[PDB]
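Re: export button greyed out
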Amino acid sequence: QEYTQSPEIKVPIPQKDWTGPIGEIRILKDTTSSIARYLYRTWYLAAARMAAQPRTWDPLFQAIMRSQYVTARGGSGAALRESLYAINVSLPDFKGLPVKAATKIFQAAQ
Amino acid sequence: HMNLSTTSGSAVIEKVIPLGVYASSPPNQSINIDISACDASITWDFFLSVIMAAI
Amino acid sequence: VNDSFSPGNDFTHMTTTFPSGSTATSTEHTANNSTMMETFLTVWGPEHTDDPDVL
Amino acid sequence: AYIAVPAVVDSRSSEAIGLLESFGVDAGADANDVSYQDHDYVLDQLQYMLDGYEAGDVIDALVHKNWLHHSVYCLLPPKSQLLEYWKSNPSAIPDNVDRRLRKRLMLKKDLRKDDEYNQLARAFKISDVYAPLISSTTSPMTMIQNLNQGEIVYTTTDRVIGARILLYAPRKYYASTLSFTMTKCIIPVPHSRFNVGTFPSIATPKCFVMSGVDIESIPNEFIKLFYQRVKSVHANILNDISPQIVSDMINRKRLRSHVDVYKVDVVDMLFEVVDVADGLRNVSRKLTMHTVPVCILEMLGIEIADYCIRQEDGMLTDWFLLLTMLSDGLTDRRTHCQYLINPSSVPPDVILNISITGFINRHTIDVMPDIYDFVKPIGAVLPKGSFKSTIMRVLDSISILGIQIMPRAHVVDSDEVGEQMEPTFEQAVMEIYKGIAGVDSLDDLIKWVLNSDLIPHDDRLGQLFQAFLPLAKDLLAPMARKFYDNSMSEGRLLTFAHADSELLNANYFGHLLRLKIPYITEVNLMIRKNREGGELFQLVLSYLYKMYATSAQPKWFGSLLRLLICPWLHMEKLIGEADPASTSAEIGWHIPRGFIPYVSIRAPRLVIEELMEKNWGQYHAQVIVTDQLVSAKAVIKGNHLPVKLVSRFACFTLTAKYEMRLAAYSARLAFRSDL
Amino acid sequence: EFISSWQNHPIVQVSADVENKKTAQLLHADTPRLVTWDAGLCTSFKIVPIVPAQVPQDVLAYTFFTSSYAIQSPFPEAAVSRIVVHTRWASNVDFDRDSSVIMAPPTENNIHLFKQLLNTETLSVRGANPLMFRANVLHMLLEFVLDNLYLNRHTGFSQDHTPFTEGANLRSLPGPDAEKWYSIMYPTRMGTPNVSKICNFVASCVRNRVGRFDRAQMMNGAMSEWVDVFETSDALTVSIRGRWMARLARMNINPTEIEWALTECAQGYVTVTSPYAPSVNRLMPYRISNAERQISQIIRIMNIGNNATVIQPVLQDISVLLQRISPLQIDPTIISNTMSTVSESTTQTLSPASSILGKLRPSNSDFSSFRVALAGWLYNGVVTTVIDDSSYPKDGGSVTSLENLWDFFILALALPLTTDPCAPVKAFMTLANMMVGFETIPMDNQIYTQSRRASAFSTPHTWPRCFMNIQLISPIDAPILRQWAEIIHRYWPNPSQIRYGAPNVFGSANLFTPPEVLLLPIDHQPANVTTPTLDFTNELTNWRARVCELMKNLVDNQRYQPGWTQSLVSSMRGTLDKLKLIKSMTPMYLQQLAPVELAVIAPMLPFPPFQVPYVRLDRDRVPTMVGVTRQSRDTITQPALSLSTTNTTVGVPLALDARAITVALLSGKYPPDLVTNVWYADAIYPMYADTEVFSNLQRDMITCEAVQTLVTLVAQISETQYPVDRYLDWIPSLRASAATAATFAEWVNTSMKTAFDLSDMLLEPLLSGDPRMTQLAIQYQQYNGRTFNIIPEMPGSVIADCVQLTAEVFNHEYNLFGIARGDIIIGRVQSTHLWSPLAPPPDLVFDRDTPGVHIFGRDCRISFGMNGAAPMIRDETGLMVPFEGNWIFPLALWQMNTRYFNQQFDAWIKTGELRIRIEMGAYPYMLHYYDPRQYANAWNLTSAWLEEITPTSIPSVPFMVPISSDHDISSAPAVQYIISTEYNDRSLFCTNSSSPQTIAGPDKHIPVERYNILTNPDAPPTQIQLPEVVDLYNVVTRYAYETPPITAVVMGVP
Amino acid sequence: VLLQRISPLQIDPTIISNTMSTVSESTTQTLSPASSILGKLRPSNSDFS
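Workaround output, generated via the alternate export path:
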């Protein structure tokens, strides 16, 4: 009941307003009649201002960002295990550890 | 840097009582806006496409 | 989905709903909220209404 | 003589496969004249370098590499670790080392608190002993120069490029990464007349770069970047030779195992539209059609000649239509723009006679879509008026090894979901004229919405879309959900759709594809008869579907067809005369007391015998069996089967019909079928 | 219902979108491909058979013709032969220009060649609008030249071992087959057994002009430098390739010059060597002119206008290079160590050392801002570096605040390193804003008062009078402010200059400065030792000392001291002393070493420096505007008269952080034992192995060539201000407008980009304006009103000259290109004579001066006949005439009244006695050959042409022509309807070439004039007859020059 | 409507966008005259009644 709804876009962006793909994404023209221009400009300027920051490149800052998501709660590491087993790479089992394997800490250790 | 954003937890103390009392006190008035099913509304068709390209 | 209360109701669902357990959800929700409110206040409203008091 | 080609080259694999023959080079009889270099390690080293530096300077430095001169890197441990390694086995100390340091190092005594050894230790520098040192700060250009001049290049870092890296000390002292691919054991080739490599070079004027493959169409992306940068910087000083020139060079004086089935050779075809209405000729346009596999060209015999591409009735011929579907599009040669063929005979721009001229670009590609990671159903999005019935007929009329790929019963059109509803969607949407204000009929609704030139006014269309969206959102979606659910339960099928939005809203499960064809589809809607609400109504409905569809790039339709057909005929070329019992196999779910097939396999005996020892039982499902002429249904609990379990080798059926031989059980699949 | 109009959806071929890859283009640009070699024949015309021969026949036995013996022949053996244009129909190239021009034999339709550019509204597939023939022909000629731009290659020879020649040397062509080429190349080699036309022509030629006849053998056992040969070719392509080779030869340079230029550019820190021995004639075209450099620089400046994001990454790259090659580095703990020894009391609430450390916050990344500030010195013309507003105090601050004192100190040290000309005024107003209320000074108005933010004084007009005249500041009321003003006037740094580059090879791109000169906002004093030690004799050190002593005076002032504790005063004085005596090497580095690094870096920058003079405190000379022009005004023709009012300003400000600059200035150190010569010899060596500048020179040359070609071509269809000659005014054309000019320019741009293999922008900066009046100039202005402007001189264009030469040749050889000239006559002629309709007898043609003709024009009215009377039409004289006689019609009249005129006139044309002369000027034609022994009528073809004429296009004009015969034949009646008004049959080559003679039909022998070299025994071997006649046998020069890379010949000592 | 239908003039707002060439004239300072004038003009709107 919660995951079966979808938005109803009464006025969608015209298809003749996106360029050819870059990577796999597309570029929205500047002549578009849609109001998405202002959202595009806001996000673009914010991204540029973020990129132009010395603290952004501080390796300690990067370490903080990387350690942020690591948590002692579950992270659905099972599907990770079947995926990595399918691509046939092998992870350490950590047999004999008296800790649960359903933690992102355990995932990071693997 | 570009809005009046707020962050708070489940604790009542962490909220901003002054803002609420200022809004409620006459002759000031307040309008309450809530987005229904924001997660469902956020999709690739409009948002994810525009924001991902922009970033 | 692995429902313990219902034996056999175990399956997989394909959905487009934005994740809730991520580390940004509320953050970009606030961002888009503010951006779209500003867009309405500055562009859409003045070019869809004509009442002088509303303007 | 070094020759560079735009593909990865290896000593053994490129020798086994006809790489030069794949590019178009004539046979060289004895192969002692040519020798292939190996550049895969160079490529992964390039990726590692790109991780640290910028692409441009690394590429520019690697341009100046002489591939005909041998040299290697010697990796040294850190300073301290080198000191302990010299303290042990003291024969390793070179003569350049200081006399006091050498004598103190022979102390064979604990030297931590002597402090003379310690002040010497601060005084020591590796550059004093070894002159050429990269030191992890050296520019790539300096790396390449020191590699070109000399034989041993000492380094203290592993982020280098150009040659193999050999350890200097036992692995214990090195604390770096275990990059054994480039790092060999601590303890410890002539060139032929022609040497074939990947990366072009400008070190000596005997180097050549092979043309004939357009720099756009290079499959490998890193090689694409390298070739782009080289051609953009050093355009005027590169020697370009045609494949014919290469063949002549190879044969001037003399002339007077497991094989992958997912690699095909494609060509670009050049042709011209000709009007022969009178006895005279009139050349109208010059077209190039891209990415045409050579095997279908050989099958349906095409030579440099004149052809008519229409039948007596007035529709396109089946062979021409199939070729266009297989290709990746048509481009106008004068104005470099995509060309869309007019399917009808309406006088403006009718193609009736074509003249083939030649083929220019020849290279090898991989038909693997690269997203078909797990075996799942396929859902393709294709707009209205795309010759769906004709494509279905042609696909159903194909059978190679008695397999009959793509039976019509294994595909579902985009209209069954609409037809299931008691008021079907088309006549359901024919009452929007009731909802809309000022319009009293479907006919004058069409007249209002469409222009005199049969083009929809944007404002009117938007209103009509406003009215249309609710019905498409709240009626079609649940029925579509039910249909896709019970179809998935019944078996794996191919599902056509008009928009990806309906699949996304119906929560379709399986791989999803967007496809398009190089035709003006709306002309078909206008021309064909037997319409429920009229050709104009169908046109408006197609416009509504295009608005409903989201923003995404539709791939060319031939991408699916190449994977669908080419591997089967390629494997037929190999095992056509083999014994079917030994070369046939099948996999399916097994129930103890039954065997319901899942995937059909064709392969050589060797490939079959390695596929024999696989742990299919790691996957589980539930089966319900009913009693019809006998019917069964399967639901997979867990993950799906990874495609590379079947591996690049062996050709497999892509769709299945769960139907036992003409109650609820838990089944584990097994490789029951065999010789 | 058969709408047939929805299919007519046009597709635009040129799209415009927002452009951010201008940064990528400025950082790196594609290099045009100039050197391409050809190993085939140097010809663009070929002879094709039209009607097969008559072998066997009932008159002459089959044992006569050589085709019966299978003897290969130089020319086709057929009844009719014609010349057709086919570029590179016999060639072996290594790179393909893809600008080919192929035509079909005249018996086929070629209408598609004249409907390429602006026929987007022509519904039919067999018709074209006659009003764009000139544009289509111009584009076709440009394609011809671009396709024929190649170089000839010397392949190899072998001696003849047969008595057909006197042992001549014959060239060998590289390809799958060679028997056909060996017979096509040398017509004179064939034997002459019989009396056929071909054999007669061969026997009427000389015997000693075939194969090679001159060589340049400069060494033993090596390829000849060049050779001269007799072979089949054409004068047009020979001349074009000769001009191309001459243009490249003017660009060739030799390794010694490269060595000298590299050494002089590297300033003696890098040494390179060149060989000294005989060599093999290398070709290394890299030298261009200062005019081309200046034009390219102006175009780049036009591209980068007012947009910071386009120029910032360039400064980032320069900063990266400076960081890589510089010896200066940050000291981690110098400030903390020097401040950890100031004497203080622990019972005070304020700590100057703690406060200053907290305000400073040193970091290693702070040096990036310092390096980009250094890089900004080279581009003050377009980029102005300023201090960001966030560095100033939020409310202006107060002198009672130690924090505000530290902010003032930081800003005072940071300001003098920026290129903003208002920096002194801002520095003064910072202290003024802080000391408001405490001390007062007289301002100018009530707007820019003493409380205005110091960052708002950004224009020369805002300089206060009290700043310029110190006497206004009261020595008693504002002693500190007067002292600060005096310090600013007598201690601000003095600009200087340095020399850079080697313009012998690279030229000079300087615009507003003398060549080879860089300006610097600080004084430069060359160092005299290679082992530097600490030194305090620097202007920056003096500046720091003066600031510190000023702050000491402020603290010791008797109106300020009583508000502070004694301990705080002592601590502040000690802190100021330590800051004054800190041991920083940055001020000395900036005076002795940074200019040298800038000078050695400048010559190899993708964007050459663009500078305007630095003024210290002279307000009258402050630059206030820099502008460029690309158009012209109403009737102004001279750029010096329209530059003032047809220019757009350029320039942008870029903000920096004062804290980072101050930290960099305070914390700098050298390596422990530094020897400058060794360090720089090590550092600079890798950088000097690049050739991107050599590529950029070629790119600039191509850019200038393209600009001149564009203006030359546009002048042909529009009205421009440049002198130019015209040759294609007889071809009809429409009244062009700005949209037409833009479309034509877009087509030219696309064609040249395709020809030279370029994917980035070219001429699009100039395509945003009306291209009918283009020009290039730049200027800048001072405060006092004086202006200095630069108008570069335009160099020539070999491509434009070749295009004009091709037009001159076309003016006489239009027939070979499928175009006819003149007008046509429609009327019934029935006879058995065998004259050709392309060369009609004179008596059939009538013109405006012929008595009795009726000339019709704009005002035509038709009156119907009644009761047996005949219908009449109104002449321009005013008389009404019946439907008979000779009429003269402009094409547009019939075009605009097609259906009515057809219906009223076709019957009288077919059967009556009406003859009409249609005035057309130029048109494409079609041929239909008919056997002369049977009945033949052309009414079907003529009626089809007349009925498919439409008000927006016409089809090709059809002609009916008989077939020549070599023996007696009977005669049959024939009916003709269309003839031309003049001779239009120059495409014929020969008739019945295998037969001794032509008894009946048109007769034409092999043209001897086209083979003047072989048929005139006393003519120089190198004579051409352009533009009247194109020769088919000439002398060709073939080269074997080498094109090695720079590093293959010039090697630097490691 | 009749004048709009019979006039040869065509109103193409891409001219202004091409001339300005500004997604963002600068990304550092808040004020950008080119972006401001483009936003005020709104060339994308296609109603010229």
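Chain C touches chain B through 13 residues (CB under 8 Å). The button fix ships in the next patch.
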